[PDB]
Structures are given as structure tokens and as C-alpha cells.
Design a protein around this ligand. Structure first.
Ligand SMILES: NC(=O)C1=CN([C@@H]2O[C@H](COP(=O)(O)OP(=O)(O)OC[C@H]3O[C@@H](n4cnc5c(N)ncnc54)[C@H](O)[C@@H]3O)[C@@H](O)[C@H]2O)C=CC1
Ligand SMILES: NC(=O)C1=CN([C@@H]2O[C@H](COP(=O)(O)OP(=O)(O)OC[C@H]3O[C@@H](n4cnc5c(N)ncnc54)[C@H](O)[C@@H]3O)[C@@H](O)[C@H]2O)C=CC1
Ligand SMILES: NC(=O)C1=CN([C@@H]2O[C@H](COP(=O)(O)OP(=O)(O)OC[C@H]3O[C@@H](n4cnc5c(N)ncnc54)[C@H](O)[C@@H]3O)[C@@H](O)[C@H]2O)C=CC1
Ligand SMILES: NC(=O)C1=CN([C@@H]2O[C@H](COP(=O)(O)OP(=O)(O)OC[C@H]3O[C@@H](n4cnc5c(N)ncnc54)[C@H](O)[C@@H]3O)[C@@H](O)[C@H]2O)C=CC1
Ligand SMILES: [Mg+2]
Ligand SMILES: [Mg+2]
Ligand SMILES: [Mg+2]
Lengths: 245, 245, 245, 244
């Protein structure tokens, strides 16, 4: 269909600009960034809008698109429970337009997390290794900390990871994130990588997600665009569309 | 429950004897091997049997178990549609008896197959690498062939793997199973290993199962023993006991 | 040193221009591409040239550089015995000029092949897996085939890889390159990757090289540039600069 | 050769006894453990000894062996610069006798450490990840610590590993061993595994060693046994025998 992009020259936005044109099914209509009026959406006959902007502006963006007709695929972060009620509330009176908000539009990332969550229950041990370029400020990554927290929740009815360590050097066993060891590698030549390691007597199971650039998000978002016409109202996360949960 | 083991002295059977013994909720009631009469099962008031014997004997074992109303958890392989049908005929006469037959009792293997199936529609490319000890007679393994067939079925209606190969040495691109390349490594020091690879521009996802030892089969078997009576009649596979939906 | 680039607008050549400019022991003194007079090098008082052009232009360039006493670091491919002998012939007249020609300037790639060669004899089994983006025409890659032949040469007089394969689908066991299986994965989202697997009972050894960028060729070329005057005549390969003995 | 095992009831020693028995070219001549007199070696006309005993007994063992012109392949650890010099001094009396002492007899481990040292010079980043079964007492492993130290030494005169980390949880970045991150994974289902990661913008290089059981040391020990008399006196490490 006919696609618009908000935050159209930002890191993710500029990437989504090139991707829509490169698609056969999809035609570019509106590319709005900072300082731009939202009229250019109605003036471009847009069917579907992608939003990768900023927490401080996104709420104003949505109030518009709903009161209009254009579907909204939102990647922009900073969301609370009271914030979704506002989106749902605008959609109560307007039951024809569909909206989706996702904290992660990378399909492989969403699949990894889901598999980790399903697998957690069945193994004695779980650890996370994440590996990034050496310009990363935060250790571990947001994704690894979140994965660890989720696996730990999936494991709340099981004993802790077995570990006879009785002598160690500080830091050897990783960050302890809700009882899950998370290790963080920072290596020139790498980009963004995460392995989830499960183990039990006689077998191991490993899940690896590798992102080599900011196009890891593209198929996820384009999936959510090609498919936003299907389900009405608000949908949170990419997982419903992946026939997962 | 009172549990007997058929094939009690075998490689897997001896493992199961030990686990049934060590399991506090299960009472080991019989250990039968070659030349032991099946009457030993009933003398022990066996309620459930684990069978890890040989395709040549399992049908006669199963006939006795079913006739006597003893639940059966069968790891023994060689089961065909005809054998499954025969099992179901026998169970008609014993509506309260349950039989669970699984071709793969490693939970990590079953999970990894499930995950491959769930991921398969959401990437451009999919291949399987399997790696085994150099005494393996079949290439690719049953499991890899099964995995590639599942992945292909999952991807029905979607474009084939992209591949510009125009010059190749015979065999480089692996075995073709329904359009899914399967590569088989035979290496001293390995046991049984399989990696499923998924990719699209900007990201890859990998699921690696490593099978090191036969103790890996224990949780799968014991889960089936504990849950056996939940489904009267024949259940094929471990998947349903894993509650993945 | 005063360094020029032949093929400065090219995929690898522009990467090299940037490299020379950024390094502050080297002065970028010439950036020639198609249609540029070679006189530009002399009018730049160029001491060393990095050549990443085309097999069709390189000997001509080389003849110029050698006649003009300009040291040459050549990445351009298509070099045969006859071409090396011609270069040898030109350097007889110019004994204080050095030419280094390498088919692979990626230090990581060079090292991995050297390691594979050193390891090959001490293991019962050796296999090569290579994985590339799906726009690659040739399977296996030149590097993989070449790595498999080095491994085979090193393993002369040892038993073949053990392999009890009695039933297989064609292609499952990979391409046989001098007795060494080579498996070629073609997966969207990959670039250039190679894994060499060694195994004997009780241990395995894996060497994995991942090539993400053309900047992978940068350190090899710059090392060659910094060390080219240290060896008269013709050096073939990057290996001799890495001081691997 | 007639080969005796000192420490024949031990984890590794018993593995060596089996290996020497199954080896077509070698004749098992003695099996000694604690409380067996060393004269059983001379009684069996032992020509070479494999020693996987204990740091407290090994020098006495060596003294006896050198005195009796019996070659020694020694895996027992605890050797010091001082202990090497003692063995070398004893060897002046018996220029006829060869001793080989190695901290690691798994050829694949010795190869990976060699590869790591070589590669360490050529990349911006180096890290070590090791992965063991969850009954392991020490983190990181002896091998992983040894490796990180050798990688550090190779990288003297290079800038440190780049790393912009400005916010971390404690432990996320591993143990710092001489400037080399070392991460210790402890996981049920695993045995003993180590990965060495090197990288520079553009490319990475990884070397992975996986030990599957105690038989990982066998070929290295047997090779040492076979080649021991090539080099008179004391050889430290297996590396020389791998004709690198
Ligand atoms: N869900 C996911 O998979 C992902 C979500 N994100 C999130 O997306 C958001 C944006 O992504 P980045 O490219 O990292 O940020 P960015 O700072 O690079 O891009 C933001 C862009 O939005 C524009 N913008 C600001 N106010 C606007 C307004 N009222 N109307 C239209 N455009 C406006 C800016 O000019 C800028 O070009 C961030 O909050 C980030 O956390 C980022 C990556 C993935
Ligand atoms: N489904 C799964 O996850 C797995 C299935 N298997 C299968 O299980 C079976 C057994 O495997 P292994 O333990 O490796 O073989 P095994 O040959 O070592 O064990 C079989 C045992 O059954 C005994 N046996 C033969 N006839 C008998 C009879 N009439 N009554 C009682 N015992 C009898 C044998 O003497 C032997 O002790 C094979 O078919 C194998 O393929 C093995 C591993 C996993
Ligand atoms: N040894 C190594 O590690 C590597 C070698 N190569 C080889 O290097 C060569 C170039 O590689 P790419 O950059 O991919 O090719 P490219 O086609 O992208 O660039 C070649 C450049 O050379 C220019 N050129 C043609 N004739 C010229 C002349 N007479 N004087 C100056 N410039 C001229 C072209 O206009 C073009 O800009 C190829 O032969 C390729 O196989 C590529 C990668 C690595
Ligand atoms: N270089 C290498 O690759 C390896 C070296 N080692 C080292 O080798 C030594 C033995 O290792 P493990 O088998 O794990 O220990 P272990 O404790 O299982 O074996 C030591 C054996 O030596 C015996 N012993 C003690 N005094 C003796 C004597 N005077 N004569 C003959 N036997 C005697 C003990 O009873 C025991 O059977 C240790 O120093 C260990 O650190 C262990 C593994 C690998
Ligand atoms: Mg019990
Ligand atoms: Mg410069
Ligand atoms: Mg023998």
C-alpha cells in the first residue's frame, strides 16, 4: 500500500524510507521529520504510517493519525500502562483504524526472546552472552538485560542454576541479572550479537541472534505494515503477527 | 506409579532403570531384559512400562502390555503407520490404557524442531547443518531430514531460498530436502549436533542443539511416564506434553 | 611514506584511500582511476602504490611502477605463473624496487589458513564449512577450496577422514576437495564466513573467520605498505610479513 | 618402547594405562600408584615413564628416573623455574636421559594457545570465553587464565582493547586478566570448552577448543613418549613436538 514515515531522516526513519521504495508492494507517500506539518500525510494520500520519532512527540502523532484514517506502526520507545489506555481510548470512538506499537521490530530478536521464554522451563542452566562493537556504552545491552529478566521470570518455579564455583576472580561469572549470568563481549569487528545458552544433563540448546546493521528492524516493520489492515484496534508487540503468542 | 523397564540392561534402558529408581514419585517394579518373561511385569504389579528394546520385539511387548492394561512409554524406534495402526487396534479393547510412542525423547531436540517450524516463515533463507560422529550410517540424519521437511512445509507459499550459485563442485550446496539445503558433517569427537540457520538482509537467527549423552532422554521419558494416563489411547510424539501452545 | 592508490574509486580502492589518509605516517600522494594518466604518480612523487584495479590493466600498471622505481602493493587478482615471471623479469632491471602481490589481504583469512595447515595432521577428521550472502555465484568459495587443498596436502599419508556413511541423499556430505568435505551455505544476512573443523576422539578444534567489510583488507595492505621496502624483488602472499615462524 | 605409568590409579594415569595397553608400538611395563616402590620400574626393565602423580612426589620420581636413565614424560604440574633448574642439573650427570614436562598435553589445546599467541599481535580486540560443566570449582579455568596471560604478553606494545563501556553491571565484562577479558560460563550438559575471539573493524577470528573427556591428553602424551629421546635433556612444553 501507500506508506508514510515520521522521523523520516532519523537513524531508523531514514532506513525505512529506502526500504518502502525498494518494496514491490509498497509506494512511498510522505517523509516527515522535525519541524514538519502533518498535513503532508493527508496531502500524500497515505494509507499506512511508520513512526520512529521520540517519546515527547509520539502521543501527539497518534492523536492525529487516529482522528484521520491512516494506520500507525510505532517503534518509538518510552511507553507506560496509562499511555496505552490513551491510545485504546482514541480507538474506542474510531473502530476502523488499526495501530501497533513494538519495543522491538527485529523479527529474529522477537523470535529469540520467545524461544528463550519457552525453553527456560526445561533446562537446569541458562546464561546469556551478548557481543557488541567496542563503542557501546552500556554493559550488558538492554536486550540482554531484558532477555535475562524474562528467562528468570520463566524460571521462577525452578531451582537456581547449578554452580559449584568455590574460587573465582571478580567478574568471571558475568553480571547476575535476576539469577541469570550475563556476559558482555566488546570486540572490534563485531556489531550486535546475542546468544542464549541452555543446558541440562546430556544436552544443550543455543539460540543466536546476529544483527549486522539497522536493517534488522526492516522486515519486522514492513511485516507490520503489510499486515496492519488485518487486525483492528491497538495491538502491542510483534508477537501476535508471528503466530507465536 | 509402579514402573517397569523393558530393555533394562540396554544402553538407554539401564539409564532409565537408574532414573526410575532415583525418582521419588516412581517405584521401580520390574527390570526385564532378553529372556525375561513378560509375566514378571504383572508379578510386580507394574502400572507403566518404559520400553527401550528393539524394533524386532516391541510389537509383541506392546501387545502384552495393552492386553494387560499396562501403560506404555515407548522409545524403541522403527514405528511405521502400519505399526501405529496396529497399536490403535489393540487399544480399542483397552479404553483406559495409554500408550505414548516418541521417535525423539530429547526435550531439547523437540523444542529445537518446534522453534525451527515457528521461525521458518519469517526469513528469506533457511538451511540445516547437522554434525555427527564418523560412525553414522545415514546422511543426513533422520532428525535433519525431518527438520528440513518441516521447515519446507512451514514455508509453503513463500519464495524459495535466494541463491545465485551458477558454478559449483558437486555436493557443495548440500542435500536438497524440499528446497532446504542440509549439510552433514562427520567428525571424530562429535556426538549428535544440529544447527538450523535462518537469514534475511540485516539479521540471522540460529538454533543449535547439541546432544552429548543419553541422560538427555531421561526428562522426556519421565515426563511421559508421569503424564501417561492423561490421554487414553495412543499419543505419538513428546510435543503435546511440552504444552507449547 | 608517500603512497598512491590505483583504483581509488573502486570498491576496495576507495577503502584504501581512506585508510592511507587516516594513518598519519603515510601521505596520500595520488588517487588514480580509469582514464587517469600514470604520470600522476610521478608528478605526486609517489613512493609506494596500492593497486586494486582489474586483471586487464594491472601488468601495464606494474610495468610502469617497476620502471619508475615505485614499490607496488598489489591486491588485484588474476595472477598466473606467466604473470609472476614477467614481473620477475621486469625487476631484474630494477633491483631496488619491491613488489608484493597477495591473493588475500585479510590478515584474519591468512592466519586461519595458516592455522588450518598447522592443525591438519594432528586430527582424525577435517571439514570446511563456508557461509556467504546469497548473491555469490561460485560454490564453494576460492578460499574454502584452497583451504581444503592445503589441509589435504598437510594430511598426505594419513588415513582418509573416517566416515561410515552407507546411505545418503546426494550432496549431504559436501564437495569433496582432495578428500576434504566442503559445505557451502548461502544465506541472506551473511557476508563471508569460513569455519574449519578438526576432530579426534576426546577433542575438537574449530577456526572460524568472519569477514564483514572490505576494511578487513586494510591492516594487511598497510602492513605490506609499511614493510615493502624491506624485501627486494617480488614477494608473493601476505604470510611472509606476519612472521609466523 | 617399554613404558611405565606413575600415578596409574589416578584420573589421568588410568587413562594412560589403557592408552599404553591399546598402543601397538608400546609395551606397558609397570603400573605404579602410591606406596609402590620405584624399583618396580627397573624390575620391569622400563625405558620411558609417564608421570601423572603429584607436585610433592614428582621430583623424587624424577631423581630416581634420571639416576636410572629412564626417560620421563611428565604431566604432573607444580613446576617452578627452580624445579626446572634442578632437573637440568641432574641431567648433566645423565646426558643420556631426556625429560619432557608439559603443562598441557592436549594437542588441540596446545594448538589453540599457539594460534592465540600468534593472532594476538594482529587485532585490536582479544577476549576469552570458557564454558564448563557446573561442577567446576574455579572460574575462570587454569587454561583460560594461562591463555589470557599469554595473549596479554603477545600484545605488549599494542594499544589496550578498545572499550567505551561507561555504564555496567558488576561482572558483565568478565574477569580482567592482564587486560584481557575472560568470561566463565557454567552450564549443565557441557564438559570443557574455550573460545578465543580476536577482531578488528572488518573481521573477526575465533578459535574454539572442546575437550570431551580425559582422552584429550592421550595423543599428546603418547607423541611425547614416542619422540622423547630425540632431544637429550629437558624439554618444556609439547609445542616443540608439534613441529610448528
Ligand atoms: N522498536 C524497535 O525495534 C526500535 C525502536 N527504536 C526507538 O525508536 C526511536 C527513534 O529511533 P532512532 O532512529 O534511534 O532516533 P533518532 O533520534 O535517530 O530519530 C528521531 C527522528 O525523529 C524526528 N522527529 C523528532 N520530533 C518529530 C516530530 N514531532 N515529528 C516528526 N519527526 C520528528 C527527528 O528529527 C529525528 O530525525 C527511539 O526512541 C528508539 O528508542 C529504535 C530502534 C528499534
Ligand atoms: N526415541 C528416542 O529418543 C530414542 C530411541 N532409541 C531406540 O531405543 C532402542 C534401544 O536403544 P539402545 O538402548 O541404544 O539399544 P540396546 O541394544 O543397547 O538396548 C536394547 C536392550 O533391549 C534388550 N531386549 C531385546 N529384546 C528384549 C525383550 N524381548 N524383552 C526385554 N528386553 C529385550 C536387549 O537385550 C538390550 O538390553 C533402539 O530402537 C533405539 O533406536 C534410542 C535412543 C533414543
Ligand atoms: N587480494 C585481495 O585480498 C583482494 C583482491 N581483490 C581484487 O582487487 C581487484 C579490484 O577489486 P574491486 O575494488 O572489487 O573492483 P572494482 O571494480 O570495484 O574497482 C576497480 C577500480 O579500478 C578502476 N580502474 C580500472 N582501470 C584502471 C586503471 N587503468 N588505472 C586506475 N584505476 C583503474 C576502476 O575504474 C574501478 O574504480 C579485483 O581484481 C579483485 O578481485 C578484491 C578484494 C580483496
Ligand atoms: N599436563 C596436563 O595436561 C595435565 C596435568 N595434570 C596434572 O597431573 C597430576 C595428576 O592429575 P590427576 O590424574 O587429575 O590427579 P589424581 O589425584 O587423580 O592422580 C594422582 C595419582 O597419583 C598417585 N600417586 C601419588 N603419589 C604417587 C607416587 N609416589 N607414585 C605413583 N603414584 C602416586 C595417586 O594415588 C593418584 O592415583 C596433577 O598434578 C595434575 O594437575 C592433570 C591433567 C592434565
Ligand atoms: Mg523411585
Ligand atoms: Mg595519512
Ligand atoms: Mg601397547
Amino acid at each position: 500500500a501507500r506508506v508514510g514515515v515520521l522521523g523520516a531522516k532519523g537513524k531508523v526513519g531514514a532506513t525505512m524510507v529506502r526500504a518502502v521504495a525498494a518494496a514491490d508492494d509498497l509506494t512511498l507517500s510522505a517523509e516527515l521529520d522535525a519541524g514538519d506539518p502533518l498535513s503532508l500525510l493527508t496531502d500524500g494520500n497515505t494509507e499506512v504510517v511508520i513512526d520512529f520519532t521520540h517519546p515527547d512527540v509520539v502521543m501527539g502523532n497518534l492523536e492525529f493519525l487516529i482522528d484521520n484514517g491512516i494506520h500507525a506502526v510505532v517503534g518509538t520507545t518510552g511507553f507506560t500502562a496509562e499511555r496505552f489506555q490513551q491510545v485504546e481510548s482514541w480507538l474506542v470512538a474510531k473502530p476502523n483504524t488499526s495501530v501497533l506499537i513494538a519495543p522491538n521490530f527485529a523479527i529474529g530478536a522477537v523470535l529469540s526472546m520467545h524461544f528463550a521464554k519457552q525453553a527456560a522451563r526445561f533446562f537446569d542452566s541458562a546464561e546469556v552472552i551478548e557481543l557488541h562493537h567496542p563503542h557501546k556504552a552500556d554493559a550488558p545491552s538492554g536486550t540482554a538485560a531484558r532477555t535475562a529478566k524474562l528467562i528468570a521470570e520463566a524460571r521462577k518455579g525452578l531451582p537456581p542454576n547449578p554452580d559449584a564455583t568455590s574460587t573465582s576472580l571478580p567478574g568471571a561469572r558475568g553480571a547476575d541479572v535476576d539469577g541469570i549470568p550475563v556476559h558482555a563481549v566488546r570486540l572490534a569487528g563485531l556489531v550486535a550479537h546475542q546468544e542464549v545458552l541452555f543446558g541440562t544433563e546430556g544436552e544443550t540448546l543455543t539460540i543466536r541472534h546476529d544483527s549486522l546493521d539497522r536493517t534488522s528492524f526492516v522486515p519486522g516493520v514492513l511485516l507490520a505494515v503489510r499486515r496492519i489492515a488485518e487486525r483492528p484496534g491497538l495491538t502491542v508487540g510483534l508477537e501476535p503477527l508471528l503466530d507465536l503468542h
